[PDB]
RNA sequence: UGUAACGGGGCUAAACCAUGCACCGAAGCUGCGGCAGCGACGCUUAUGCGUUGUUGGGUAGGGGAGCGUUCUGUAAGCCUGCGAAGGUGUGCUGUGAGGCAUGCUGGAGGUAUCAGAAGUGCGAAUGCUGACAUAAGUAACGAUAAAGCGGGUGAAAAGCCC
RNA sequence: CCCGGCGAGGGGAGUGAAAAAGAACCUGAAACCGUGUACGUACAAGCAGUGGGAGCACGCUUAGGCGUGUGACUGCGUACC
């Protein structure tokens, strides 16, 4: 259950080496408006692939 | 007369933590581990002044043996022939000559072989 | 003054080819390890690899005196349940001839990264031919 | 000018904030802004407010030039921690730390 | 043109014009010492080694410096026996400037 | 030290060190192991040791030219300016005036002067004889310190 | 548990017996340099200087000699806003505890020398008090009665209001 | 005045000898946590040092090399109480 002695700050950083959050590669541009959005998502202004979907 | 021991203790700890500079982890940061580290470093430095004097002699002896075996003779017969030829050249100088100027070493092996054989 | 030390960039290494036919195992292996470490050169340095490259041809024809051809057992352990494998000198010579020479030399070398590098200097073949003709291997007889 | 902007006593631990601060170091500031926009963290909205405050200070206090800005030095320091008491089982008490942080962004044309 | 000679209990190899740090001599700082016990003189390939201190050749050197070495910190420690000991050392030397190797 | 003599926890059963009271000098706010009392620092001097010390100080004082002997030393009014000008004319900076009899007049005119002190012959102490740079004394004070000591 | 009863490689000598000559080999001994103790032998005994000899592993313990901290006198002196204490570096220096100098910070104190007095020196006591780590962004988020959608509010709504 | 939620927090301006004196306020140490720069490190086993020591990087220079930092490889070395 408990440790026999405490780990180092080195073994702590090596453990946290795999915790880096991936960035989004690039946001895509809509054809009509030009606003950035995620792929396969609608924009904030409700456009998807050049079509006004939500009011 | 109440004596407060902050300044003297901080100086005595900074003295030790200056000597543990370059050690891994808490040995260069934490006072207790740095004190044990500095004390064992002093013990090792004493022991290794002695072992330095040993290790350089065995290095010179290996080089003299190699450069003598390139001249036919072993180390043992070379040192025996140089003792019977009455020279005072020690092993530091013989090793330096054996690497740097091989002509003098051939002359020395010639003298030692003339005395030995 | 300070004593001379070798430097790993300026050390100039030679190539040798040794025909191991009809020779004793451990005598040849001792000469090989001595040449591999570099103890025959005057500019010997205990932490710098000073030795030379050796191509040992004909590891099939190595000899062992006494009844060691049938009774020198090589033990190695696979790191498992209880499997201790063993092979005598005959089936080791037949199955994998170069392993005899490499085991005999690797037992005689220092252990550590420098010893592994000076073992990488050694190149053992079982045939009479080698593909190292572009480095001019001189005959080192022993 | 290097044009710092801070948020002192940010209500999140410095490890979680440092996660998204790793993402926007050295980037051009528009890439930094939309990467911070499309990340699913609350440390993202914290350092996004600090980054836009830095761009606004660079606009208003000194010369010009929105588009040349690069997020040179972003770092998260650990702020004070507030001590609370968590009641555990069988009468023994605990102590939880509400961690804070100082977020600092330094954005410049160089 | 190099000579081998014994100065302060130990040997030294020496060229003309190099500065050499040896043991402390009782010689002032603006004078010259002449080591007459020269073990080996080698110029070109004509190496003259001797049944000891060969003949004739004298090594004249002019003293330049009288410093002390780096402070060595000697530490004695016996673990769990309540004993440690601290000592310092600096070793005197003498720097000589070689100005000639005779025949 | 204020506090109760109750054990803060048990003797056995906890992970804590054994403790008996909050008033022990290991603990904070509860204290001193060997606490001081008001103590008398007066040490006994022999009478003959004191007299020999005063004779040694007077002998070295007359040996070292720091001892002036004056026929009669008189100041009329209790003004300190008068004694300041008097010691100015006698080229005196740091004075111990041992007059033969402490008149209230000359004593009142030296109370504000810093490096000047006026004593009687009975008020001679060792440390003031060593302290002031020039002891000056009237001749009757010389007679009184001679007959008192020797 | 894995060869596993030369430390190993390996050895038919690299084994054993005898004889010998070399050499390696310790902090032993010698060489060189330095420091200290004890005892003799002189110079005129600043109780030193020198010459000689010898000693110098150390626990419990005994003996001797010191460093440093706070306060008192010297000291209404001396240093100090052209910068004190404290902090933080660097360089010198001493056998050691230490000391001196100086860069940056700091912004008002410090203290020679020789004496004196100790709340005088900490790494340990499952020491005490505060701060901060580790486990670790891990377990958990407190009844398995259950939520879903629309509208509003708002900088923002799974949880608020309808 | 500006960003921000007619926020918190910050950046200027201003006061002041000083705002790294801004009320979480003289000084501001250590543990602890970070950012940058130099060197090392992804075939190498263990009190993490010490003796030897290449290479690299900054400084210089009497132009030979020294100093500072790091330190591959290598001998020895199983903390303290």
From Swiss-Prot, chain C:
GO MF term list: large ribosomal subunit rRNA binding; mRNA 5'-UTR binding; mRNA binding; structural constituent of ribosome; zinc ion binding
GO CC annotation terms, alphabetical: cytoplasm; cytosol; cytosolic large ribosomal subunit; ribosome
GO annotation (BP), single: negative regulation of translation
Keyword terms of this UniProt record: Ribonucleoprotein, Ribosomal protein
InterPro entries reported for this sequence: Ribosomal_uL13 (IPR005822), Ribosomal_uL13_bac-type (IPR005823), Ribosomal_uL13_CS (IPR023563), Ribosomal_uL13_sf (IPR036899)
CDD domains, A to Z: Ribosomal_L13
Organism superkingdom: Bacteria
Oligomer status and interactors: Part of the 50S ribosomal subunit.
Entry function: This protein is one of the early assembly proteins of the 50S ribosomal subunit, although it is not seen to bind rRNA by itself. It is important during the early stages of 50S assembly.
Family, as annotated: Belongs to the universal ribosomal protein uL13 family.
HAMAP family per the UniProt record, alphabetical: Ribosomal_uL13
Descriptive protein name: Large ribosomal subunit protein uL13
Organism annotation: Escherichia coli (strain K12)
From Swiss-Prot, chain D:
Record InterPro entries: Ribosomal_uL22 (IPR001063), Ribosomal_uL22_bac/chlpt-type (IPR005727), Ribosomal_uL22_bac/org-type (IPR047867), Ribosomal_uL22_CS (IPR018260), Ribosomal_uL22_sf (IPR036394)
Residue numbers binding L-tryptophan: 90
Keywords of this entry: Antibiotic resistance, Ribonucleoprotein, Ribosomal protein, RNA-binding, rRNA-binding
GO cellular component labels: cytoplasm; cytosol; cytosolic large ribosomal subunit; large ribosomal subunit
A Gene Ontology BP annotation from the UniProt entry: response to antibiotic
PROSITE patterns reported for this sequence: RIBOSOMAL_L22 (PS00464)
Highest taxon above the source species: Bacteria
Keyword Cell division among UniProt keywords: no
UniProt-recorded Gene Ontology molecular function terms: large ribosomal subunit rRNA binding; structural constituent of ribosome
Cited HAMAP family: Ribosomal_uL22_B
Note: The wild-type allele (erythromycin sensitive) is dominant over the resistant allele, and is also dominant over the temperature-sensitive allele at both low and high temperatures.
Annotated PANTHER family: CHLOROPLAST 50S RIBOSOMAL PROTEIN L22-RELATED (PTHR13501), LARGE RIBOSOMAL SUBUNIT PROTEIN UL22M (PTHR13501:SF8)
Family, similarity comment: Belongs to the universal ribosomal protein uL22 family.
Subunit annotation: Part of the 50S ribosomal subunit. In TnaC-stalled ribosomes forms part of the binding pocket for L-Trp with the leader peptide and uL4.
Name under which the protein is recorded: Large ribosomal subunit protein uL22
Species annotation: Escherichia coli (strain K12)
Curated annotation (Swiss-Prot), chain E:
Keywords tagged on the record: Ribonucleoprotein, Ribosomal protein, RNA-binding, rRNA-binding
InterPro entries: bL21-like, bL21-like_sf, Ribosomal_bL21, Ribosomal_bL21_CS
Keyword hit for Cell membrane: no
Top-rank lineage group of the source organism: Bacteria
Keyword field contains rRNA-binding: yes
GO molecular function, one term: rRNA binding
A GO BP annotation: cytoplasmic translation
GO cellular component: a single term: cytosolic large ribosomal subunit
UniProt similarity note: Belongs to the bacterial ribosomal protein bL21 family.
NCBIfam families to which the protein is assigned, alphabetical: L21
Physiological role: This protein binds to 23S rRNA in the presence of protein L20.
Subunit structure: Part of the 50S ribosomal subunit. Contacts protein L20.
Protein name: Large ribosomal subunit protein bL21
Organism: Escherichia coli (strain K12)
Curated annotation (Swiss-Prot), chain F:
Effect the entry attributes to changing residue 80 to I: Does not regulate the S10 operon; assembles into ribosomes in vivo
Statement: the UniProt record of this protein carries the keyword tRNA-binding: no
Record keywords, A-Z: Antibiotic resistance, Repressor, Ribonucleoprotein, Ribosomal protein, RNA-binding, rRNA-binding, Transcription, Transcription regulation, Transcription termination, Translation regulation
Residues covered by region (Disordered): 1-20
An annotated Gene Ontology molecular function: structural constituent of ribosome
GO CC terms of this entry: cytoplasm; cytosol; cytosolic large ribosomal subunit; large ribosomal subunit
Keyword Hydrolase: no
Mutation effect (residue 109 to V): Does not regulate the S10 operon; assembles into ribosomes in vivo
Annotated effect of mutating residue 116 to D: Does not regulate the S10 operon in vivo
GO biological-process terms attached to the record: cytoplasmic translation; DNA-templated transcription termination; negative regulation of cytoplasmic translation; negative regulation of DNA-templated transcription; negative regulation of translation; response to antibiotic; ribosome assembly; transcriptional attenuation
Similarity comment text for this entry: Belongs to the universal ribosomal protein uL4 family.
Subunit record text: Part of the 50S ribosomal subunit. In TnaC-stalled ribosomes forms part of the binding pocket for L-Trp with the leader peptide and uL22.
Further remarks about this protein from its record: The erythromycin sensitive allele is dominant over the resistant allele.
Full protein name: Large ribosomal subunit protein uL4
Portion of the full sequence shown: 52 to 201 of 201
């Amino acid at each position: 259950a408990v440790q026999q002695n405490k780990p180092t700050r080195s073994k702590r950083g090596m453990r946290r080496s795999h915790d880096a959050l991936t960035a989004v590669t690039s946001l895509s541009v809509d054809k009509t408006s030009g606003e950035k959005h995620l792929r396969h998502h609608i924009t904030a202004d409700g456009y998807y692939r050049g079509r006004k979907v939500i009011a | 007369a109440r004596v407060k021991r902050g300044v003297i203790a901080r100086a005595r700890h900074k003295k030790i933590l200056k000597q543990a500079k370059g050690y891994y982890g808490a040995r260069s940061r934490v006072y207790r581990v740095a004190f044990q580290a500095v004390i064992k470093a002093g013990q090792y430095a004493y022991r290794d002044r002695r072992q330095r004097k040993r290790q350089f002699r065995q290095l010179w002896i290996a080089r003299i043996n190699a450069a003598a075996r390139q001249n036919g003779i072993s180390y043992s017969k070379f040192i025996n022939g140089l003792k019977k030829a009455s020279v005072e050249i020690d092993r530091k100088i013989l090793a330096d000559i054996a690497v740097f100027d091989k002509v003098a070493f051939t002359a020395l092996v010639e003298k030692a072989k003339a005395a030995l054989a | 003054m300070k004593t001379f030390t070798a430097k790993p960039e300026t050390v100039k290494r030679d190539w040798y080819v040794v025909d191991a036919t009809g020779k004793t195992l451990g005598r040849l292996a001792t000469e090989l390890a001595r040449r591999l470490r570099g103890k025959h050169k005057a500019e010997y340095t205990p932490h710098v690899d000073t030795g030379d490259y050796i191509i040992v041809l004909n590891a099939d024809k190595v000899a062992v005196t006494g009844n060691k051809r049938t009774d020198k057992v090589y033990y190695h352990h696979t790191g498992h349940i209880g499997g201790i494998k063993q092979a005598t000198f005959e089936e080791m010579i037949a199955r994998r001839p170069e392993r005899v020479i490499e085991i005999a030399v690797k037992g005689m070398l220092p252990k550590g990264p420098l010893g592994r590098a000076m073992f990488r200097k050694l190149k053992v073949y079982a045939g009479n031919e080698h593909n190292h003709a572009a480095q001019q291997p001189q005959v080192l007889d022993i | 000018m290097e044009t710092i902007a801070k948020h002192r006593h940010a209500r999140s631990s410095a490890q979680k904030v440092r996660l998204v601060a790793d993402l926007i170091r050295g980037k051009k500031v528009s890439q930094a802004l939309d990467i911070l926009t499309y990340t699913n963290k609350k440390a993202a909205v914290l350092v996004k407010k600090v980054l836009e405050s830095a761009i606004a200070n660079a606009e208003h206090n000194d010369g010009a030039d929105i588009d040349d800005l690069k997020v040179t030095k972003i770092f998260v320091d650990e702020g004070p921690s507030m001590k609370r008491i968590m009641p555990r089982a069988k009468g023994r008490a605990d102590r939880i730390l509400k961690r804070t942080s100082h977020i600092t962004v330094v954005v410049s044309d160089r | 043109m190099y000579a081998v000679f014994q100065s302060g209990g130990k040997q030294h190899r020496v060229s003309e014009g190099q500065t050499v740090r040896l043991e402390k001599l009782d010689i002032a700082t603006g004078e010259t010492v002449e080591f007459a016990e020269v073990l080996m003189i080698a110029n070109g390939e004509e190496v003259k080694i001797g049944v000891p201190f060969v003949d004739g050749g004298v090594i004249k050197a002019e003293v330049v410096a009288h410093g002390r070495g780096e402070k060595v910190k000697i530490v004695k420690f016996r673990r769990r026996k309540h004993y440690r000991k601290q000592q310092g050392h600096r070793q005197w030397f003498t720097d000589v400037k070689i100005t000639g190797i005779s025949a | 030290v204020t506090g109760s003599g109750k054990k803060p926890w048990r003797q056995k059963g906890t992970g804590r060190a054994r403790s008996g009271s909050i008033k022990s000098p290991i603990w904070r706010s509860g204290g001193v192991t060997f606490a001081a009392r008001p103590q008398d620092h007066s040490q006994k001097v022999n009478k003959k040791m004191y007299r020999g010390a005063l004779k040694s100080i007077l002998s070295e004082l007359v040996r070292q030219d720091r001892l002036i002997v004056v026929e009669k030393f008189s100041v009329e009014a209790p003004k300190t300016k008068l004694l300041a000008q008097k010691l100015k004319d006698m080229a005196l900076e740091d004075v111990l005036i041992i007059t033969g009899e402490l008149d209230e007049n000359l004593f009142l005119a030296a109370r504000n002067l810093h490096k000047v002190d006026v004593r009687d012959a009975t008020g001679i102490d060792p440390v003031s004889l060593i302290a002031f740079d020039k002891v000056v004394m009237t001749a009757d004070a010389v007679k009184q310190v001679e007959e008192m000591l020797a």
